[PDB]
Structure formats: C-alpha cells, structure tokens
C-alpha cells in the first residue's frame, strides 16, 4: 500500500556537521538538525530558554504559543553527553521531516552549555535510533513514521559528501523509505545487528596496514551518523595513533602534512569483509608542507555501558561507505559511495 | 590551521567560619605595581603547566571568546564606538564575571554560571591565569618581551563592609595583583576622583571611573584594569606620519608602523572585506579586518564579530604584503554592570543580588569597570590602514581572543573614558 520515498538534502559544514531542515508546529517553525543513528531523542532550543545561555540566543528557538497543533506535556528531560549536558521538557507537535508530517514528542531545551553547542551550525538533533536508547522512553520519530505505513520499505539511508571533492554542490542526502542508487555503486553488503535496540554490529578486527593491531579477539561497532569522526576507546585510539606516528596537539591528533599521504590504510573487519580507509579518507590535507600539522578525522570517546565500550563509525566512515539502516530485518547495508 | 574544528559526538552517555577584614583606606601609601615581576610570575606558571592544564586553559579560552563576541555586540548595539575606538577583552570580561561568581550564592551564582556558559570557580580562574601565561611566555627565548599583559583588580568597599579573606585569596588564582581599599561613597564624584587618583599612583595608567552615575547607596566597586603591549615582528616606526581618514571630510596625521613580509591574507569578494594576520610570536598574532568600502564597517562587523565565530579567518592563505597601520596607544573604559543592565538579559548585579561569600554585609554595586590600556609597538600587495578598521589579538596555543577592537579614530583622548 505504502510506495513513497522522501529525500532530505543536507549541508556539509567542514566535513564535521551534516544537517538538514525539519518543520515543527502549524505553521511550521524550521530548525537545522543533525540526524544521528547513535541516539533516539528529538530536541530543539526553546523560546523558554533563558537569554543568559549564549548557545540559545545564537540558534532558532521553538515558540509553542505560535503553533495551533502544539500539545503540552512538560515532563523534565536531561540529555547527558561526554563534556556537557542539555536539559528541558517534553512537548508534542506535528514535525515535518522530508515531505512526511508526523505527531512527535520532542525536547524543548531550556539549558544549553556554550561548549560545545556554540560551535554547532545545527540548532537541534533528530535521533534515528531505537526507543531502547530514548531518554524518558519517548517513541522515536522513525517508529512513528513506520506506524503511518506510507514508506516503501521500513529503511532509511545516508550519503555524506567530501567538502573538498565537491565545491558549491550537494553536501549530503538522507532517504526515508529506501536508498538512492545515484550515490552508491554495486550492491549492499548487509550485516545483522547483534541485538535490536542499538545500530551496533560485531567487528572481527581493526588493521593498520596488513597487520591486525587492534580488536584481535572481537569488539563492538556502533554506526553513529551524527558523530563527526570515527571514535574508539582511549585505550584503542592511543595504540592506533602510536602505530600511525600521530601526536596529540591540544584536542586534535595530528601528523606532519607531508607524511599524511604515506600513512597506512585503516581496515575495519565487518561481516567477514574488509572496510578500508586510505590516509586521504581520515586525514584533512589542508597542506602538504613538512612544517604544517594536519588533523586526523579519528578521536577517543569512552562510551559507557551498556552500549559501550564500543567503536563509533561516524561521518569519516559514511563519506566512504553509503549506509542503509533496515528496521524491518534489523541489519545495516554498506556500499561504496560515489 | 589556527582555528579548532570540533568533532561532534551525539551518542548519549546518560552519566567553620571565614576570616574577614575592613580593607586599608584608599588614601594610605601603596608602592607602584611591578609589571616586569608580574610577567615573570606568569611565565613560570606557563612553564609548569602539564598538557591537561593546557586543555582546560584552551576550553576557558573558547568560553571567553563566545561571551566576548556577545558583550562586544551589546556594546556596539547600545553605545556603538564612543569617540574613536572600542577595545574589549573577552578573557578579562569572562574573568570579571568568574571573579564575581566566586563570591556569589544561589540565584546570583546560577545566573553567572549560565552566562559564563559552563561549578568550581577556583579551576576556571586558574585556567584563565594559564591562558595569560601561555601568551606572555611566547617570545621569551630572546631577551626582548614581544608580549606584555598586566591585570590589576581594584575592590573598593564602603565603611562597615568586611571582605571575606577566602574570596580575596581566591581572586589571586587568576589575578595576583588585587588591591582592596576602603572608600567613602556618600559623594560619588569625590569617590570616582579618589579611585582614579589611587590607580594613577600604583599603575601610571590614565583611568576614568563611571561611579558618578551609580546608586547613592553603593557600597562596592569591582574594577579590572588591563595593560597590553604588543611588539609586531619585523615592524618599524616610520619617521614621517601619514593621514588617517576618519571620514570623507576629516583626516588626522598619525605615526605609522610599517613592515613587509609573508602574512596570512584573504580578500572576501561576496561579503566585501580583507583579513590580514600580523604575528607577534609563533602562536599569537594581530588580526586586521578592513572593509573594501569605508561605509560598510557596520556591515563587515555584522559578518565577522557579530556572527560569534572564527569562520572569517578560516580561508586565510599566505601572501607577500607591505602592511602600514597606526601605532595604537588606546586608553578607554566602560561599565560592565551598566552594559548588562541595558542589554536583553535578566538582572544579575541588581539590588537583590547575593554575593555573601564576598561579604556578610550589604553589597550594592556602584560600577563593574573594565579599563584597557592597549599598545602596538615596533621591533607586492599594499595593505594600508588609513581608514577605519577592526582588530583582534588571537593566541592559537589557548584558542583565546585576548582583545577585540574597532578603530574609527586612532588618536588618544580622555573621552574613551566617557560613560553614557
Ligand atoms: C538513563 O539513566 C537514568 C538515571 O540513572 C536511568 O533511570 C534509572 O533506571 C533504573 C533502571 O535500571 C531505575 O531503577 C529501578 O528503580 C525502581 C524504583 O523506582 C525499582 O523498582 C527497580 O528495582 C528493581 O529492578 C532492579 C534491577 O535494575 C533490581 O535490582 C531490584 O531488585 C528490583 O527488582 C524487582 O523487584 C521486585 C520486588 O522485589 C520484583 O517484583 C520485580 O520482578 C523485580 N524486577 C527485576 C527486573 O528484577 C530499579 O531499582 C531507576 O529508578 C532510574 N532512575 C531514575 C532517577 O529515574 C535510565 O534507565 C537510563 N536510561 C537509559 C536509556 O540508559
Ligand atoms: C507526557 O507524555 C507521556 C507519554 O504519553 C504517551 O505517548 C505520547 C506520545 C502520547 O501519545 C500520549 O497520549 C501517551 O499517553 C506520558 O507518560 C504516560 O503516562 C501514562 C499514565 O497516565 C502511562 O499509561 C504511560 O505508560 C506513560 N508513558 C510513558 C512512555 O511513560 C506522561 O503522562 C505525559 N505527561 C503529562 C504531564 O502530560
């Protein structure tokens, strides 16, 4: 009965923030949002957010009073990240994501720390994960979209473009209901999720060159579209960066820009197949000078249990491999992006 | 290259008594502030920083930038350029509110905590000292001091107001030089003269208190005085001065610093402005924004500082440039209390405030003065700053804006200490 797919065009900011637009309310109030498979909550800044919070003042605010479809809830909501925490209250309203209108519970955020959100081009987050991950056990937006039964398939897919490879053209694309064969070549290699409730799969090993340096006895791999870099445990990333000859410069891991192009391939062993990134895929080659330091698109994030410890495959991975998230068969499909 | 690009990770973790004292009368004899000794003190702080300390320093650097751009925007909106120049210090403004936070409890603490954008005042103030250390420690391989940054904090209190010692000792974590003095507020114009006289004695800087336009019940002034001296690498004082065009009908002959070499540059054709980076040291530089047409300055400020971002120095690229600009000697001040009170904010430093860790006695804030003494000194595409421009002082090592500036008129004048 349902035969519709929907395409959301994304803006690529510095190969770190891939964001699209959603409407909330009647009439729609538009917000720039990152679509994260690593989380399950929808939240945007609130009009009720104090002007003291710089991060609220320099982003779009949701005014509930200007929405004729707004329904009050007011249940407190706290979303805890690595460094900072955003908090607010739940509200219900009609959200327009793609061309699909859906009644959705989301967070009106009234407290935003300057760090890291003053570096965010996006206003809010759309969680594309499972209700098991949703704080306050709030029904995720993609569950409520499946309930409508309008989608061709209960799947969504991600294309992220390179910022340098293309200039003044498509930053990225989310498809709800299928995958766009214009942005991937060949067929999808599908890998079953370990368990429903997380976009997480088994990883057999992580190879630097031919040798398998890390994840020798097996480990976990969360596919997080909202994560800028590939992340691993502090333990794993310190070993990886030792092997690459990369040094810590303030917050970044860097190598000399001239040594960047000779850095070895990094391979992630997923579903009995090698997913390889060359130095061109995980180094930001701003220069090729022997005096300048170039940043690696890889960092340490110690994700707590029960989801972690785990690797997170972010935009660095997805830029290489077009990714299809299949809720029907609880599996992830990877194919070469073009 | 010089700007931090944050990698986002949106996976949800889901995890008896205080000694007090009446400060010494302001009239009492105090020895001048030793600026050279204060620099040496900061350089040692820098040399003893571990890599975790440098990370915490870089974080408060970024926090200070965000608040600094915001409060610069408030100044620009509410007052604009007051008689030639506006100079604001993101780090000092952040330090002032972090210093008041140390003394604050309950609603006042919560509000200050929110606007700073981050609980432990001691750690924040220590990090902010590290930021200043990381700046002045640069260029100390040679005997010449390319960078000097002196901060003096005046804490002027009415009779019967006892400062708590832990508060005063706490401020030392950020600013070693803290001068608490008892001062009569019954005549506000006489009170302002006495502060300006005392600050002239101990520093030798031209200062102007705003305390005339304060509450008659005022018991506390919390004034921050900053002196920056920056020697630009490969620049000399031209013997002959050149015309600076304030407008189409007005010019002033001023001494010009001239230097030629390889400076990072970018001419933005769409937004219509040129950026130039003149280094002081390895990591610390002077940024110079120049509108392509002199009438667009407000528009250019709108697309740079007012965006509250460093994206306008992202596209910088090396270039062979001959840079001529005025030898700046700017002495000005504004009341932070008054700025915040007239801006689009809830009340922080109102009559109903709680600074009970500062004193148990009645606190009524007369002014929170931020006073800056800014000096640029000496050691093909011609970039000539002979028309109004914006500037900033940026340190890569702490991702820290030390100063934001707008120069409509490069002349020194006492009317930079005028308060609305
Ligand atoms: C994000 O983080 C928040 C905050 O930390 C989490 O919220 C917490 O979630 C906990 C669940 O893991 C909540 O803990 C429960 O609190 C209940 C009281 O309010 C209590 O009833 C529960 O106790 C039972 O379960 C425990 C297992 O975790 C057992 O150890 C315990 O013995 C109890 O077991 C039951 O016992 C009765 C009678 O004795 C039997 O009849 C039942 O059959 C038993 N059941 C089971 C399964 O054994 C438990 O302590 C906690 O309240 C809550 N905290 C707050 C402040 O709300 C979120 O979960 C987390 N979210 C995500 C997505 O990570
Ligand atoms: C705020 O909403 C929650 C969730 O409400 C449910 O889901 C919404 C999307 C909407 O469809 C509602 O009609 C649903 O009821 C409320 O939590 C529920 O509380 C009831 C108790 O009356 C309970 O039966 C449900 O199991 C709860 N659901 C969850 C997920 O906890 C909550 O009561 C609302 N709060 C207010 C103040 O209105």
Numbering used by the authors:
A (entry chain B): 3 to 340
B (entry chain A): 1 to 15, 29 to 131, 142 to 402, 418 to 458
Reproduce passages from the article.
Cleavage of AGT by renin is the rate-limiting step of the renin–angiotensin system.
The crystal structure of the AGT–renin complex shows that the N-terminal tail of AGT is docked in the substrate-binding pocket of renin. The total surface area buried in the interface between AGT and renin is more than 2100 Å2; interactions between the N-terminal peptide and the renin active site account for about 50% of the buried surface, whereas interactions between the bodies of AGT and renin account for the rest. The Asp38 of renin is hydrogen-bonded to the carbonyl oxygen of the scissile bond and to a water molecule that is also within hydrogen-bond distance to the other mutated aspartic acid. The N-flap of renin in the renin–AGT complex is in a relatively open conformation with the tip of the flap shifted by about 5 Å when compared with that seen in the renin–peptide complex. This cavity corresponds to the hormone-binding pocket seen in two other serpins, thyroxine-binding globulin (TBG) and cortisol-binding globulin (CBG). The entire helix H (residues 330–336) is unwound, with the shift of residues 333–337 opening up the pocket to accommodate the N-terminal tail and with Asn331 and Asn334 shifting to form key hydrogen bonds with the body of renin.
